[PDB]
Paper text:
Bacterial-induced MNGC formation requires bacterial motility and the Type VI Secretion System cluster 1 (T6SS1, also known as T6SS5), one of the six T6SSs B. pseudomallei possesses. Hcp and VgrG (valine-glycine repeat protein G) are secreted substrates of T6SS that share homology with the bacteriophage tail and tail spike protein respectively, but they are also required for T6SS function. Hcp is required for both the assembly of a functional T6SS and the export of T6SS substrates by chaperoning the substrates, which includes itself. In this study, we have identified an extended loop region of Hcp1 (Loop L2, 3) that shows a significant movement away from the main Hcp β-barrel domain as compared to other known Hcp structures.
To understand the structure and function relationship of B. pseudomallei Hcp1, the crystal structure of recombinant Hcp1 was determined using the single wavelength anomalous diffraction method (SAD) with two molecules in the asymmetric unit. The model was refined to a final R-value of 0.248 (Rfree = 0.285) up to 2.7 Å resolution and has good stereo-chemical parameters. Each molecule of Hcp1 consists of a β-barrel domain, with several loops predominantly on one end of the β-barrel and an α-helix (Ser69 – Lys78) located on one side of the β-barrel. Notably, residues Asp40 to Arg56 form an extended loop (Loop L2, 3) that protrudes away from the β-barrel and is well defined in the electron density map. In particular, the major extended loop (Loop L2, 3) between Asp40 and Arg56 of Hcp1BP is significantly shifted by 18–20 Å relative to its homologs. In the crystals, the asymmetric unit consists of two Hcp1 molecules and the hexameric rings could be generated by a 6-fold symmetry with 12 molecules forming a two ring assembly. This stacking of hexameric rings could form the tube-like assembly with an outer diameter of 80 Å and an inner diameter of 40 Å. The symmetry related molecules of the hexameric ring show that the extended loop region of Hcp1 could potentially act as a key contact point between two hexameric rings. Most of them are hydrogen bond contacts involving the residues Gln46 to Thr50 from both interacting monomers of the stacked hexameric rings. AUC analysis showed that at 2 mg/mL, wildtype Hcp1 demonstrated two peaks corresponding to hexamers and dodecamers (black histogram) whereas Hcp1Q46AE47A exhibited a single peak that corresponded to hexamers (red histogram).
Numbering used by the authors:
A (entry chain A), B (entry chain A), C (entry chain A), D (entry chain A), E (entry chain A), I (entry chain A): 7 to 18, 32 to 89, 105 to 123, 141 to 154, 160 to 168
F (entry chain B), G (entry chain B), H (entry chain B), J (entry chain B), K (entry chain B), L (entry chain B): 3 to 20, 35 to 89, 107 to 120, 144 to 168
Write the structure that this text describes.
């Protein structure tokens, strides 16, 4: 994960479960992006970014860069932290996104 | 899986769970196809088609050919990717279809 | 299973889970049959009848004979295939019925 | 189980799970019996009574005697079969009742 | 459990799971007690009190004393039996209460 | 019904009439071993609790054999011994099941 | 009730009155072995925590035997020893269960 | 269909026509061991209960082999022996599966 | 846990699962805090604070200090106990909060 | 509270104040074996992560014993050793639990 | 796609193009043991059933090795042997995975 | 972030920056055994798949050790060896975790 917040700037352990959903029946006049839901859930331990992600989650801070190499592979736009579980004997950060790219390279709802 | 997109053309690991449902009570004036839901879920690893399927899923790209040999057996029409889970220690691609053929050979809602 | 379709005629591996439900409170003016739901779910492998059952399921083809010996025991009327899951390392065919007979011999909503 | 139907007369393997529920808040003007739900679920194999219970279930036949010794202990009134699952490698018959007696001896909504 | 019914008087095996819930958002004009739900579930075998609790459950009989020592610790007011599961190879009696005391000693919605 | 149950001392009066049948046979028979000694038959009965409970529980600890064991639904079992009770699992030798309708009976290691 | 519990030193005062009963007997009795030594009786009690908790937890570590063990519901147990506590599983020898109504009692390996 | 089932004494009449197929082969073959002896084939059939139940249950205890074993869906099995029945798991040697459409058949350890 | 009630003052075993949720779509005119839900669930045994937390839960007593060191790390404002499960062979206290701080140090909806 | 935790070198400063208690005693005591050596006490603590995490994780690998171990809720433990941590399971010898109210304490294998 | 699959006799025609990849390496390598012999690679493929099913099932019983094994998504596998099929789990030696985009390939125990 | 990962030949370029940490220590240390040899440390990383996948999968089969292993969240690990990958479980010796805020680090079996 290379991650940078709108506010907190750059934030410094292998996530990750990528979930994407699209209804078979598209609402009349609805954009595919609005009908779809993209969510990637990252699991990792707890350290210096934990308070940074937890602040972003409560303040609705946008991720300025969200790039997952798996220079990378997954790149996500309009990233918003939507859920987090911190616990003990790990945390699980669930992100919501709009545009995405996987690298043949695929991309949808991307923005220049 | 022999697969080809409307847009991406031909896309290059053993799925697969075929689910089909039909309500016992058919709505007055409703076609059996509209009441039914056909879904096949394919599990496979992750490689050159992964970004291709993931782009199709976000762009609502129609599969032009969807043929599962199991020259084949399962052939599906109006194929639309409706869901996908990519994760680690695989992905799971869930397709929605209208017409279908299994090969005695059976076929319903097929189109020339 | 000795099975014959309305259309496909006779169709050629030990199912089976029989489920039947009846509400304690019967709606005013409602027939017991309409309040009840009879469902038998058969699990078996996949072969020459698989496409035949899968076609019946999509075309809403009525089973003309549905007799389960367990010359038999279970016999079912107005049989309609309502669900099917085909998968790998089997299929599961879920039938809906009205009249039934088990053989003391019991029978309800049967028709000559 | 000593059991006798309204219609089938006397019917000839250790059930049994007794479930009874009562809401803490009783509806204004509602009798405790109407708010409550008594259900006993009997599991047993499959034999001469199986078609008899299965006929009762579809025909809404009232049990004339329902006495479970565990000369007995559990005795139930207004017994109606509400659910049944027959299956293989057993059946499970779920009864609904009004009045009941367990034997100190307890009894509620009983009738002479 | 030292227990005495409103009606059955005194009733003669280590429960017990105490559950209490309170919504974070309190309805305007609502008392905390009415928003909350207190439930203690006792598991024990089956014997002379079994028919006594089962009668109380069907007759909505109030427990006059409900004291759980764990001279005791848990004491509960306005105790009403709300659920019970009797079964075999135990019963589970689920009580609902208003006032409570645990013994530092805590107490809420108690009454002299 | 449930079970008609008589005991080889003593006595038999558990209230009448009062399940999961398991039978195993190794695929390879030990050289010189009779199938009966190689096989294992156990029927597990579920029920609530009363007058038979202490009678079953005394039998289990005293290694008291049954003398009649028939659970009609008809099953009949020989050399029945209680091997486990969570408050009932019986172990048997000879066995007979007989269906209805038909009068077909299967039986093995039965004794004159 | 719960348990009336006295201890063989020391003492007995855990507040009165304060479960899953398991008993096992191997189908084949070791040659020359008494059933009591071959069998295993354990009753597992669930409860909250107070004045008896340290008393139970001290007994478990000190291998302190009980002297009265009766959990009335009536069960009575001899040579009761605490073998496991996740904050309670007792192991016993002799046992008696007695039902109500009736006055029927089963008992094995009881001692004068 | 279900199964056409004939038995090597006696007899064959379980009502016709009446599943999970498992086959295992260790990756490393024991030196001097034939694959057939190293492998294990078992097909587990689920079904309700009737005229074949006592016939299957008698066969299982008597170590009665089958002589025809074909479950058409076509599967055919040799040296079929019932090894387990929870009221059916068969163990086999030779096997053949044949698909439709096509006429393709796979077969191993089959016998003339 | 260093904890102090509004009323009970200071209250005297390693929780803890921190859950925080934020909807991707923020209601028009809604503050992020009102859309979000912060919940931390602490598991611990049962002792002198148990009645104190249980009283707070029923009386809707505000925690004046809620500081979890893991001088600390987690600090929570407007803490309200919303749920509790006390049981046996532990309790689980579920808190709801507004402002929070984890220590880089993150903080949201905090108040001087 | 959580835990007050001091360590036998070094040091003790994990921020204060910072669970599932398991204790087992075999029913049969090995001849000549002291109960303490036969028994096993382990308390499993769940918590998030901070300044104590590296301190706990260093202790676990260095086989560093604790010198104060008290988790107040009061539990006190001797010879405390960390045996497992999934990012905490401690193993102990002597133990004391003390309830409130009352001042009742149980204790075993405690040391002067 | 699925798999392109050729077999070392005979033959290869299972319809093209037709999963969970597991690889294990003990942390401590046996003295004098090559990693390949110490490791275990198995890929489990899920799919429906047709013309390849009898071909896979014949291969599994005949210990028929594959000669081409490539599942493109690209995976390529050597010494592929079917070890288990519930109606497919393959065991392999050499392996290659190659990603897209990039042209990066990892490979071990591959053979010229 | 994820992981910064360098390898001891060859090479290191899996795209940067790219989990469940388990550590076990037996309560009783084998006589003459160093804690490090008695303990077992494994961190399990979950992630999607790309350029590092073949690099991780080649390393696992070739018993290729890592030379930098740091997963920042900061964890640092020595003698890191891949032991299992379902398409990642690493085994390590020395370890360091360092929290933020604070600058507190725990470390064991680290090497100069």
């Amino acid at each position: 994960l290379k991650v940078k917040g709108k506010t907190q700037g750059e934030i410094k352990i292998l996530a990750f479960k990528n979930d994407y959903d699209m209804p078979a029946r598209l609402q009349e006049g609805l954009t595919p992006a609005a009908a779809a839901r993209g969510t990637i859930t990252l699991t990792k331990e707890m350290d210096r970014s934990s308070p940074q992600f937890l602040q972003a989650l409560g303040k609705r801070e946008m991720m300025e860069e969200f790039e997952i190499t798996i220079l990378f592979t997954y790149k996500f736009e309009k990233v918003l932290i939507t859920h987090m579980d911190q616990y003990s004997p790990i945390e699980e950060i669930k992100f919501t996104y709009s545009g995405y790219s996987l690298e043949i390279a695929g991309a949808a709802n991307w923005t220049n």
